[PDB]
Subunit: 241 residues, 3 copies
Amino acid sequence: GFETLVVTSEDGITKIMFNRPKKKNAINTEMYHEIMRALKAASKDDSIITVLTGNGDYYSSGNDLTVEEKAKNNAVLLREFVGCFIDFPKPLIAVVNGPAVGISVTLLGLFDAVYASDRATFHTPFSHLGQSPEGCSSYTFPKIMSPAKATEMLIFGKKLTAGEACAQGLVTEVFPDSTFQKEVWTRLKAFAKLPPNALRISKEVIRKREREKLHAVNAEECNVLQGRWLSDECTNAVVNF
Amino acid sequence: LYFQSMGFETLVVTSEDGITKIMFNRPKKKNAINTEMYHEIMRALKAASKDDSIITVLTGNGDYYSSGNDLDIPPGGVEEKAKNNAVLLREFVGCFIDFPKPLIAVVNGPAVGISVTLLGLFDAVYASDRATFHTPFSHLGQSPEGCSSYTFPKIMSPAKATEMLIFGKKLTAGEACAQGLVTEVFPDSTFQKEVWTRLKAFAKLPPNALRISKEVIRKREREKLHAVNAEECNVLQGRWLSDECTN
Amino acid sequence: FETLVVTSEDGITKIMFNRPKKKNAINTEMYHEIMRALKAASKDDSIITVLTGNGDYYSSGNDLTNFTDIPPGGVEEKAKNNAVLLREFVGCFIDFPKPLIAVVNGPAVGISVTLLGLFDAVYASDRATFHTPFSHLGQSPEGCSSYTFPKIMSPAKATEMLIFGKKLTAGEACAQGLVTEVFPDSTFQKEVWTRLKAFAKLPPNALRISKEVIRKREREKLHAVNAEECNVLQGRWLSDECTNAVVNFLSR
């Protein structure tokens, strides 16, 4: 089973829900491995669409504020983690139920659609903790949002409302919080009735030609990040947090 | 190769005031694109590429822009039919990729299918607010075409393009403008006046400068676009032979 | 510097265009001065570099007086030289290693707009307008805009600016991806500088390295695009269309 996730499947939809509500669904080492196991399963299961979502208040507070060998290992872990999203074969949808921070935001550039509650916020304060972008965001975010918008978020740590994230290309659509659940699931159940192989083959035509590039971006990002974790600037920034 | 107008069976093709206008002309069929119209569009584009016009416009007659592909098996079966349609598609999309002059769409009404996906290859797109945009490929058991699998994520962002291309969502003119597919939307009652006043203005700009500027923008993308086209057409061949497409 | 004012404080180097009586038009000397200002800024102790204009304009772009400075080698040599100069100017922006922010205080035109595509952020007054009338001038795109504008704004929007010479309001440029944010003119300086001074307090290696991971893998493409745009211009400049245009615009 799963300690940190609740994974369910029915009617052509697999739902992966982060399940550390007391910790704002902060991603610890366990959850990194569990998310990868769940995605590996979903890639081979009978579902047409896979959804990631959060339990409760937050979608995710991002990497859990939990040694050269540790930075190597974590960089290796991170690279494999990101690689699962890059290689994921079926439509992948984020259902962003509340605030989203860190690696949980950056991965959104690898998702096929992203629905957000009006109470969702989006925040990538990497530079504030003395680190660099990951999840391929160094490549995807400038492309999605434009460099002039991506920069405020990636380099300068501006926090976006769900409306702003929608306007800037990161979010497909925003629903009021009161009916968010209803509105998203009625849509997704509708999508799960579409010809299965058509959906799968359509995403492959869109994604396949980009994967080699996205894997190289990931590798570059994790290298830089490994460097940042070993730096005095990062330890001081994080200690000073 | 023509003087003022060139007769076609499914198109009206005219040239005045520095603008070649290519208009779909099957209004009783919602300007659906049949085999005849694919070949006729290709000939018109070849002609427009060589005539003295500065700008070329694609539009529809009547209430639709185009309802897209119009819904006989050769001796080598449905497999050969699939390859033949894939080859025709590839050459067709190719003519749009390689078109050397500014190419503008005047979307007077609903656009569906291949007529929408090619808009990714246009220089400008002017829509009436009663224009709607729909690419229900997946609903018909098919996959993207017209280089949309590449151009649409780029233009609209993946998050918006997926909903259009994979899940078959229909966009209003305003949504398509908000998401970068449409240059500008006009009220239907001003549409023809406003669009044609601009276009006639545009056609008075220094002609070589307009052509050379389009070419600086587009030339270095062509090899990639031709490669996307070939891949999409190859995938589509397989879809057309699948249970989902037929059933 | 004759045509710029370069200062540095609070972790920010400010390069300000300084020909207000000529709408901060970029003459030959200003091209060289900007390159030198960026060279100095690349190695100084600031963490953010800002470009802005003095007076009511950001910049009116290339100074058309630049076409009248005819060397002893004639217009052919001049065309070749100025194309190389342009190539190396734009390449300074492509290669600039620290966060580079435009503070667009008023109307911006031509090369001054196109370069915005290579900046990290762009903050504009609601008095700012953006115009790239290359076609009116019988010219073709520069500053990598032939690649960056379609990517940033979408082909459908980029064409109207680049080919057909539409002038954008600050709000439209913000809506279309060129500008990060727009502020009321009355509060613009205080709102922008309050922000920039906070940004300058962020861990400086993180800021530098984050920019490098975003920008480094795209630089070879950008240099190739710049090289091709410049090769075309070298031709355009010697066209009847550009000659006739420049004689008209010089009469304005």
